[PDB]
């Protein structure tokens, strides 16, 4: 009985100029999950297995397979089109930003077999506005709707377990009955993103 609705984007055209933007959100999103994951115990593999913890992801945002690469570009342009569709406005303001960021060193067990090292953008400098932080928690609640919808019209429901042969996951579930533990991780993903635009010197205001 779950009817996740989210912010309705069928009318909104990302303008040509975001195309940047959304591409530089959606590597740096990635970086941040690999990183989560490699702090969960999380290695490398050719094949996903969760009894050993590999996972195909784990690489570049590039060598990313293409379903899996073209899910976090729609996720991404979701993102800016529903900003987009919320009233806020994405103009450049500093274009000097670009310029003294800085990618986060990670120490160097965090390499994998693959040689791949998760470094996403140190932005612990960028300090949101209140009113941003709103923002957030727009983002994050509506990114789960985004993500239940589609899970939902690919044959997912709810499970105890999750289970990727009978398309079941426990985190099929409306916002508020959802744990906090990830309500949290997913908040902090779409503040790291809200931060994405500020570092990299765009404008995030209605
Ligand atoms: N919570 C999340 N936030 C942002 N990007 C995510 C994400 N979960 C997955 N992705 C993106 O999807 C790609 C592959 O998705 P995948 O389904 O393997 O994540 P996952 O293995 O963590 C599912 P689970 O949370 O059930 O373990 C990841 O490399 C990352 O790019
Ligand atoms: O589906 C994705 C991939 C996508 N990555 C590209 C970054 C674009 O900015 C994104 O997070 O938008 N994440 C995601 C979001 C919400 C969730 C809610 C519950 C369970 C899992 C969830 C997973």
Same mark, same amino acid.
Request: net charge positive; with cysteine.
């Given at each position: ?30 970086? %941040? ?6 702090? %969960? ?32 570009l729609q996720m991404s342009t979701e993102t800016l089109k529903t900003l987009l569709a919320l009233g806020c406005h994405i103009a450049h303001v500093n274009p000097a930003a670009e310029e003294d960021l800085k990618k986060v060193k990670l120490p160097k067990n965090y390499m994998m077999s693959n040689g791949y090292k998760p470094a996403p953008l140190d ?14 928690? @727009? ?7 985004? *993500? ?7 044959? *997912? ?25 990830? @309500? ?23």
């Amino acid at each position: 009985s779950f009817i996740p609705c989210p912010v309705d984007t069928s009318q909104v055209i990302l303008p040509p100029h975001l195309e940047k933007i959304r591409d530089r959100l959606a590597e740096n999103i990635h970086e %941040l999950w690999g990183m989560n994951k490699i702090e %969960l115990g999380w290695t490398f593999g050719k094949i996903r297995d969760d009894n050993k913890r590999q996972h195909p992801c784990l690489v570049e945002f590039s060598k990313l397979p293409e379903t899996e690469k073209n899910y976090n570009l729609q996720m991404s342009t979701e993102t800016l089109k529903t900003l987009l569709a919320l009233g806020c406005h994405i103009a450049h303001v500093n274009p000097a930003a670009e310029e003294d960021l800085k990618k986060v060193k990670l120490p160097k067990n965090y390499m994998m077999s693959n040689g791949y090292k998760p470094a996403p953008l140190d932005l612990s400098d960028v300090k949101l506005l209140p009113p941003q932080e709103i923002l957030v928690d @727009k983002l994050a609640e509506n990114a789960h709707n985004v *993500w239940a919808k589609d899970r939902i019209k690919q044959g *997912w429901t709810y499970g105890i377990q999750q289970d990727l042969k009978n398309k079941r996951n426990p985190r099929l579930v409306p916002y508020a009955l959802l744990d906090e533990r990830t @309500k949290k991780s997913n908040r902090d993903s779409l503040r790291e993103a809200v931060r994405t635009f500020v570092g990299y010197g765009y404008n995030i205001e209605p």
